[PDB]
């Protein structure tokens, strides 16, 4: 009912590492979206709450999650952002789907041990 930041961190970091380590599939997700650099300048018109892996890492590192479902919500926000923004035929969309499949596998037994 009260989760200490260092125990969320130690429980959840390996699930975040599972996403990061997927190469090339994590590469679009490792840093905040820079719409001008990426040549997707309308991104913030579509995606109102951006999220990426390095953001989620920083949140886990600084104790910003009071409970583990908040971490799951940020991961899924990142995925929902990609599935909204990109066409279903896009390699970014398909990479997002692969990362969600990996996440589902890794997070389910972790959320159960919590
Ligand atoms: C996964 C394994 N390690 C940790 C685990 C818990 C806490 C920290 C680490 C660790 O390793 N922290 C240093 C770092 F620097 F790795 C940050 N690191 C973590 C993965 C996400 C990521 C992405 C890019 C760069 C670093 C990084 N549990 C473990 O099971
Ligand atoms: C989250 C945001 N990302 C992009 C989106 C559209 C276009 C580009 C990106 C993006 O991030 N580019 C940086 C990259 F590092 F990913 C480059 N590169 C590495 C190898 C693997 C690969 C695969 C597909 C596209 C690029 C890419 N749509 C999005 O929603």
UniProtKB/Swiss-Prot annotation:
Q: Result of mutating residue 44 to A?
A: Impairs binding to acetylated histones
Ranges for domain Bromo come to 3-110
The annotated consequence of residue 83 to A reads: Abolishes interaction with ASF1A
Query: What does the UniProt record report as the effect of altering residue 88 to E in this chain?
Result: Impairs binding to acetylated histones
- Where do the record's region annotations for Interaction with ASF1A lie? 80-98
Q: How is it modified after translation?
A: Methylation of the KIX domain by CARM1 blocks association with CREB. This results in the blockade of CREB signaling, and in activation of apoptotic response. Sumoylation negatively regulates transcriptional activity via the recruitment of DAAX.
What does the UniProt record report as the effect of altering residue 34 to R in this chain? Impairs binding to acetylated histones
What is said about its interaction partners and assembly? Found in a complex containing NCOA2; NCOA3; IKKA; IKKB and IKBKG. Probably part of a complex with HIF1A and EP300. Interacts with GATA1; the interaction results in acetylation and enhancement of transcriptional activity of GATA1. Interacts with MAF and ZCCHC12. Interacts with DAXX; the interaction is dependent on CBP sumoylation and results in suppression of the transcriptional activity via recruitment of HDAC2 to DAXX. Interacts with phosphorylated CREB1. Interacts with CITED4 (C-terminal region). Interacts (via the TAZ-type 1 domain) with HIF1A.
Q: What does the record give as the function of this protein?
A: Acetylates histones, giving a specific tag for transcriptional activation. Mediates acetylation of histone H3 at 'Lys-18' and 'Lys-27' (H3K18ac and H3K27ac, respectively). Also acetylates non-histone proteins, like DDX21, FBL, IRF2, MAFG, NCOA3, POLR1E/PAF53 and FOXO1. Binds specifically to phosphorylated CREB and enhances its transcriptional activity toward cAMP-responsive genes. Acts as a coactivator of ALX1. Acts as a circadian transcriptional coactivator which enhances the activity of the circadian transcriptional activators: NPAS2-BMAL1 and CLOCK-BMAL1 heterodimers.
What protein am I looking at? CREB-binding protein
Species annotation: Homo sapiens
Lineage start = Eukaryota, Metazoa, Chordata, Craniata, Vertebrata
Span within the entire protein?
1083 to 1196 of 2442
């Amino acid at each position: 009912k009260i989760f200490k930041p260092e125990e969320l961190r130690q429980a959840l970091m390996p699930t975040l590492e599972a996403l990061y380590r997927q190469d090339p599939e994590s590469l679009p997700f490792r840093q905040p979206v820079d719409p001008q650099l990426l040549g997707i300048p309308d991104y913030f018109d579509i995606v109102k709450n951006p999220m990426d892996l390095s953001t989620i890492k920083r949140k886990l590192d600084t104790g910003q999650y009071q409970e583990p479902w908040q971490y799951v919500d940020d991961v899924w926000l990142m995925f929902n952002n990609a599935w909204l923004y990109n066409r279903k035929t896009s390699r970014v969309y398909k990479f997002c789907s692969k990362l969600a499949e990996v996440f589902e596998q890794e997070i389910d037994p972790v959320m159960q041990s919590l």
